[PDB]
Ligand binder design. Structure first.
Ligand SMILES: Nc1ncnc2c1ncn2[C@@H]1O[C@H](COP(=O)(O)OP(=O)(O)O)[C@@H](O)[C@H]1O
Ligand SMILES: [Cl-]
Ligand SMILES: [Cl-]
Ligand SMILES: [Cl-]
Ligand SMILES: [Cl-]
Ligand SMILES: [Mg+2]
Length: 852
């Protein structure tokens, strides 16, 4: 094929040949690396997250509970797992079931951090229809709405299922939820399952066990036995955990340990660890790993905690008590007198957002913002903090929009607005404007959706124009800025109107739950426990008999539950969930990759040759725009509006509007596919100025490709991706390639006029044919060596992993049958597909020695 082009007179420019060869070499090498699938995401490199993702993401059909505490990165961990599985080919179809109001947050996270475009399925967009899309997000309610729909989902042949906030799957002996039942049915037909929930087990042990049974109903079949085994385990594991903290062990703990591990002699290991010797610490970390292989929830549950990971800011509450204006006092009394009585909730909501009462009787569009002291306080705060990036949160979009107008007209400060009525692209623009340094918006006004999952590293100040109606929404608001890696303490300003539901609720959240300044896993439990009572205080804030006691009771419940949670921590599992030194090393290794000058040089040459225009902005960023004369009509991922790119991870994290270019980015992969599936650079001729060789000497640079045809799911690329084999032959068939390195030789060559070129080739066409014949014999030898080596490394690696899981099963009940059968079956189909591998000539460059 490539020789046919050359002789038909079709001669590419030399630089195209070099680009083609580099593209093959690079793509064949970036497939066989340990951190593959953990580079391309727009995230910081946090060890505990990478620990989970690298462990879970490389398994066959992962079935796990991701139970990290709030803010630790359960969404990011799920993303890295999906990213790895979809890049490697282990998965192709993914379903993500989330709570109703979280769909857009997930859609943006998957696309903007993992370059994965999920299709949103709801009833408005579609009143089976799931074969249409490979990546689907929908709500839990949507998925369980009808029995027809559920069965549609089960038969849609999903590879992986992700269920966010899985504590909504509630179970009971006599009436499990519809939610639970729906996931129970789906989990039987999807091989891989990720359940995400931070809910501590002490608040629902039974439901916790039910979720584990969704993952492995075979192993998790006896609630009582499971609890008993965990209870007997804690004594062992608590001590060992106190040893990784360096408090030496007893003689009691030493026989319990020798027994807990009867599969081998650990007397040396124990003698070391339980002593003040320089070999004591490593003896401890190894013991910890042995205990975790025997853990009851080993391999299935990952629970990192904020106490352990410790990268989170302090939270500081600043309340401002403001006088209640006569206009609102009047409206409250009028409503109590002339009021068509409403629900408890609706009266409370009226008292929490008093502008709603005022608008009811003065008509909507009444200028509440002209006398509401919260508005005046906000104007004052913002005009004296003009250089502070401030996140301002209201419950309702209409309130945020009304504030934007006031702030602009009365003080000339332009705020970005963020609410669910706006399109994704509209929120993208508002987000970029708020993130813009020095020239951008100083304020982001949000409805209850906050800032979704977008990072504003520079924002540490938050104003709650009003308060949310329940504690889950409160923590979600604070979680917009209380994020891992935020250095500056969060200042939470709460201006509130005295003698209203606002003052009641601010006191309840703060004094009852301590929910502002400390992350509160107790909030929902206490709220539901006192709901009726609290709602009446909110509905009648001027009738507060017994409120002081409610506060006292609620705080006592909060402290009691906090104590239970502290006492019930599995501190061994917490340590093991962070990943230790192996996880730190994995993060360090990925970061070493990041500084890849090869990729930057390759990508520029690639885009240039494809025909994409490149404008440099100086700030580690470049603007890419389509051109008239590009290799293809429309390059996927490239709009006529252009795209901003960066190759630097820290820039990409600060500029969420820019693409983060890595070997794993679709632009590179699409770019490689374009060049390598086509003719570009496959046929050329060059001159070599060299007087130490006879003039007219002919050299043929041959690039063969060795590749095995197989389904992507087999993941042959781990062992034999399409691999180039470069030969450099003379007339006698001597292959010089082993001692003539490609780059050094490539530099020594000269381009030649294409017309003069096609004349040189025709003059030596027959010599070339003979050389090509000599190459075919040598490629068979080379390809057979490459193939046999890969077939053997597949044997070694895959048999090694099957042995590792069989050895784990001897001590661990959580290794599943289908896991061992999957490795076994894959080791077989991989070896067979390689022994059908083939080769072909991909490119050639003729080289003619001159002396001139
Ligand atoms: N490694 C990371 N790099 C960048 N952003 C991160 C990282 N980890 C978490 N975040 C951000 O922190 C926020 C919380 O992440 P998330 O996974 O939703 O926490 P949760 O465990 O409560 O579900 C999100 O906005 C996410 O984008
Ligand atoms: Cl992988
Ligand atoms: Cl895929
Ligand atoms: Cl006032
Ligand atoms: Cl942020
Ligand atoms: Mg979450």
């Amino acid at each position: 094929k490539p020789q046919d082009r050359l002789f038909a007179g079709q001669i590419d420019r030399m630089d195209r040949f070099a680009l083609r060869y580099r593209a093959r070499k690079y793509s064949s090498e970036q497939f066989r690396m340990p951190y593959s699938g953990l580079r391309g995401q727009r995230t910081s490199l946090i060890p505990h997250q990478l620990n989970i993702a690298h462990d879970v993401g490389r398994r066959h059909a992962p079935r796990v509970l991701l139970a990290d505490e709030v803010g630790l990165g359960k969404t990011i961990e799920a993303g890295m797992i999906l990213h790895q599985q979809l890049l490697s080919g282990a998965a192709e179809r993914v379903l993500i079931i989330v709570p109703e109001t979280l769909q857009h947050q997930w859609l943006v996270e998957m696309l903007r951090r993992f370059n994965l475009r999920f299709a949103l399925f709801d009833d408005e967009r579609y009143a089976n229809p799931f074969d249409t899309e490979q990546l689907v997000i929908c709500s839990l309610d949507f998925a369980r709405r009808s029995k027809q729909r559920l069965e549609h989902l089960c038969e849609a042949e999903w590879d992986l299922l992700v269920v966010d906030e899985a504590h909504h799957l509630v179970w009971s002996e006599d009436a499990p939820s519809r939610e639970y039942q729906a996931i129970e049915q789906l989990a039987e037909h999807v091989p891989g399952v990720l359940l995400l929930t931070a809910t501590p087990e002490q608040l629902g042990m039974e439901s916790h066990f039910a979720r584990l049974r969704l993952l492995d109903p075979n192993r998790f079949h006896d609630f009582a036995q499971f609890v008993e085994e965990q209870k007997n385990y804690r004594p062992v594991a608590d001590a060992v955990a106190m040893l990784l903290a360096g408090n030496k062990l007893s003689n009691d703990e030493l026989n319990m340990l020798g027994e807990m591990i009867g599969e081998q002699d650990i007397e040396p290991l124990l003698q070391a660890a339980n002593s003040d010797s320089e070999d004591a610490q490593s003896a401890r970390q190894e013991l910890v790993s042995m205990l975790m292989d025997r853990h009851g929830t080993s391999r299935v549950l990952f629970r990192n905690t904020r106490n352990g990971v410790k990268g989170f800011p302090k939270r500081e509450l600043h309340t401002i008590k403001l006088p209640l204006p006569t206009q609102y006092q009047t409206a409250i009394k009028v409503s109590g007198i002339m009021g068509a009585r409403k629900s408890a909730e609706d009266r409370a909501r009226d008292m929490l957002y008093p502008e709603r009462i005022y608008q009811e009787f003065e008509g909507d569009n009444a200028t509440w913002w002209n006398f509401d002291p919260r508005v005046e306080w906000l104007m004052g705060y913002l005009t004296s903090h003009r250089s502070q990036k401030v996140l301002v949160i209201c419950a309702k979009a209409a309130t945020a929009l009304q504030l934007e107008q006031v702030l602009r007209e009365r003080e000339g400060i332009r705020a970005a607005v963020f609410h669910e009525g706006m399109s994704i692209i509209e929120r993208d623009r508002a987000a970029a404007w708020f993130a813009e340094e020095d020239t951008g918006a100083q304020v982001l006004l949000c409805s209850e959706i906050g800032s979704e999952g977008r990072n504003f590293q520079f924002a540490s100040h938050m104003v709650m124009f009003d308060l949310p109606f329940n504690p889950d929404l409160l923590e979600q608001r604070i979680g917009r800025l209380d994020r891992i890696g935020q250095a500056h303490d969060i200042q939470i300003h709460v201006p509130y109107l005295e003698k209203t539901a606002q003052s009641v609720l601010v006191r309840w959240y703060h004094e009852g739950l301590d929910a502002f300044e400390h992350t509160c896993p107790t909030g929902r439990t206490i709220y539901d426990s006192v709901y009726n009572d609290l709602i009446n205080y909110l509905a009648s804030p001027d009738q507060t008999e017994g409120f002081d006691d409610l506060i006292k009771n609620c705080r006592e419940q909060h402290e009691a539950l906090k104590a239970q949670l502290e006492q019930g921590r599995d501190r061994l599992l917490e340590i093991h969930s962070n990943g230790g030194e192996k996880a730190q090393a994995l993060a360090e290794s990925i970061e070493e990759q990041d500084d890849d000058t090869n990729l930057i040089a390759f990508a520029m040459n690639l885009f240039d040759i494809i025909g994409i225009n490149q404008d440099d902005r100086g700030d580690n960023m470049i603007v890419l725009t389509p051109s008239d004369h590009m290799l293809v009509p429309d390059f996927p991922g490239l709009s006529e509006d252009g795209i901003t790119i960066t190759f630097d991870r820290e820039v990409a994290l600060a500029r969420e509007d820019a693409q983060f270019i890595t070997w794993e980015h679709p632009l590179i992969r699409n770019g490689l596919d374009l060049i390598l599936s086509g003719d570009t650079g496959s046929s050329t001729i060059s001159l070599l100025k060299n007087k130490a060789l006879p003039v007219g000497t002919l050299l043929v640079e041959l690039i063969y490709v060795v590749e095995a045809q197989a389904p992507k799911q087999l993941q042959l690329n781990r062992f034999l991706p399409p691999t180039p084999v470069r030969m450099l032959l003379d007339k006698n068939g001597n292959n010089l390639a082993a001692q003539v390195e490609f780059e050094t030789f490539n530099r020594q060559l000269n381009a030649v006029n294409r017309h003069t070129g096609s004349k040189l080739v025709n003059a030596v066409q027959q010599d070339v044919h003979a050389i090509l014949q000599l190459g075919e014999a040598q490629i068979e030898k080379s390809a057979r060596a490459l193939i046999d080596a890969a077939r053997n490394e597949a044997d070694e690696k895959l048999s090694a992993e099957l042995s590792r899981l069989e050895a784990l099963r001897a001590v661990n009940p959580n290794i599943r049958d289908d896991e061992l059968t999957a490795i076994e079956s894959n080791r077989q189909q991989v070896m067979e597909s390689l022994d059908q591998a083939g080769w072909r000539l991909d490119a050639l460059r003729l080289i003619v020695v001159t002396h001139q």
